[PDB]
Amino acid sequence: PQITLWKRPIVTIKVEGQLREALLDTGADDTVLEDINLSGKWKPKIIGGIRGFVKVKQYEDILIEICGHRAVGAVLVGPTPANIIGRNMLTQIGCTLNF
Amino acid sequence: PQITLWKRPIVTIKVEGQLREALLDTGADDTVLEDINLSGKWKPKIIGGIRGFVKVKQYEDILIEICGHRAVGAVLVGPTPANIIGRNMLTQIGCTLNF
Numbered sequence: 001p002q003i004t005l006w007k008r009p010i011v012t013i014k015v016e017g018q019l020r021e022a023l024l025d026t027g028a029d030d031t032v033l034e035d036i037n038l039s040g041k042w043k044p045k046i047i048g049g050i051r052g053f054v055k056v057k058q059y060e061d062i063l064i065e066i067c068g069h070r071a072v073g074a075v076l077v078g079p080t081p082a083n084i085i086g087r088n089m090l091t092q093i094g095c096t097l098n099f
Numbered sequence: 100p101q102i103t104l105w106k107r108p109i110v111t112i113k114v115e116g117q118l119r120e121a122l123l124d125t126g127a128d129d130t131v132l133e134d135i136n137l138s139g140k141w142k143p144k145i146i147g148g149i150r151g152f153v154k155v156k157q158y159e160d161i162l163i164e165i166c167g168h169r170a171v172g173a174v175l176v177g178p179t180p181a182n183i184i185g186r187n188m189l190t191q192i193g194c195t196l197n198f
């Protein structure tokens with residue numbers, strides 16, 4: 001679809017039988033999922049933001065179903081305020097900025 | 100133009116005779132400019148991110164020339180790692196997410 005930016009570009013995602021709402025975020029390298037247990041093993045990682053750095057679990061090969069389009073990727077899981085779909089996921093659903 | 104998200108969607112902006120590079124950031128409500136003095140008066144404001152909340156100077160009616168398209172807006176100025184063009188500015192250059 002074509003999402004205008006008058007409101008936050010939140011979309012439905014489906015990660016392992018769990019529906020969430022994630023924000024499509026062009027200013028995020030990575031995808032960060034807020035406090036939702038993912039089956040599988042992970043490796044420790046730290047993303048930085050505005051202000052600080054949070055500790056996250058990185059999971060590889062996670063399947064995320066984003067607004068009707070699937071995409072497998074590294075997914076970071078950690079105490080972030082929102083689900084963030086970063087460019088790593090956004091390139092796979094073929095998402096572009098447009099003006 | 101059409102910016103794919105394989106790399107950070109950084110673009111040229113012109114803010115008061117100053118060229119900067121800003122990231123077009125769909126996950127930012129506001130626009131945040133990194134440590135570059137803006138003529139004019141401001142009001143105190145605080146944006147939150149990943150981890151924490153930075154103090155910024157909000158300036159109204161700031162003219163930002165974004166990748167060939169102008170846009171006047173509230174611009175927040177404060178110790179952020181990057182210039183971030185938030186949705187507030189991104190709606191005016193007619194920028195949409197596209198997949």
Ligand SMILES: CC(C)[C@H](NC(=O)[C@H](C)NC(=O)OCc1ccccc1)C(=O)N[C@@H](Cc1ccccc1)[C@@H](O)[C@H](O)[C@H](Cc1ccccc1)NC(=O)[C@@H](NC(=O)[C@H](C)NC(=O)OCc1ccccc1)C(C)C
Nearest residue numbers: 027028029047048049081126127128146147148149180181
């Ligand atoms: C999701 C992250 C992986 C993302 N980080 C990255 O992409 C960075 C560059 N990559 C990275 O960290 O790489 C890993 C690494 C590790 C070690 C060494 C080197 C590298 C990120 O948080 N980046 C953010 C800022 C940034 C930019 C450049 C460099 C570093 C950080 C925004 O782009 C991102 O879009 C966030 C999304 C977000 C929203 C809400 C909560 C948490 C995260 N927006 C923001 O932080 C913006 N805030 C907002 O939009 C808030 C929500 N609105 C607001 O403040 O309005 C008033 C308000 C006040 C109080 C409550 C509610 C509203 C900010 C730019 C102004």
